[PDB]
mmCIF file of N, CA and C in Angstrom:
data_model
loop_
_atom_site.group_PDB
_atom_site.id
_atom_site.type_symbol
_atom_site.label_atom_id
_atom_site.label_comp_id
_atom_site.label_asym_id
_atom_site.label_seq_id
_atom_site.Cartn_x
_atom_site.Cartn_y
_atom_site.Cartn_z
ATOM 1 N N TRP A 1 -0.898 5.466 2.650
ATOM 2 C CA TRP A 1 -1.692 5.097 1.445
ATOM 3 C C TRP A 1 -2.695 4.010 1.813
ATOM 4 N N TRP A 2 -2.706 2.965 0.998
ATOM 5 C CA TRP A 2 -3.579 1.822 1.203
ATOM 6 C C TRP A 2 -3.063 0.661 0.378
ATOM 7 N N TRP A 3 -2.591 0.965 -0.825
ATOM 8 C CA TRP A 3 -2.034 -0.071 -1.674
ATOM 9 C C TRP A 3 -0.642 -0.426 -1.174
ATOM 10 N N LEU A 4 -0.025 0.512 -0.456
ATOM 11 C CA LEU A 4 1.314 0.286 0.077
ATOM 12 C C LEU A 4 1.266 -0.773 1.171
ATOM 13 N N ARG A 5 0.378 -0.593 2.132
ATOM 14 C CA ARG A 5 0.279 -1.556 3.215
ATOM 15 C C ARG A 5 -0.296 -2.878 2.714
ATOM 16 N N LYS A 6 -1.164 -2.818 1.708
ATOM 17 C CA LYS A 6 -1.743 -4.041 1.165
ATOM 18 C C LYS A 6 -0.672 -4.814 0.406
ATOM 19 N N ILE A 7 0.116 -4.095 -0.390
ATOM 20 C CA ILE A 7 1.193 -4.728 -1.130
ATOM 21 C C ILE A 7 2.256 -5.153 -0.123
ATOM 22 N N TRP A 8 2.277 -4.437 1.000
ATOM 23 C CA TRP A 8 3.217 -4.717 2.076
ATOM 24 C C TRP A 8 2.472 -5.254 3.291
#
C-alpha cells in the first residue's frame, strides 16, 4: 500500500 508503511 502506502498508508500502511506511512502509518507503520
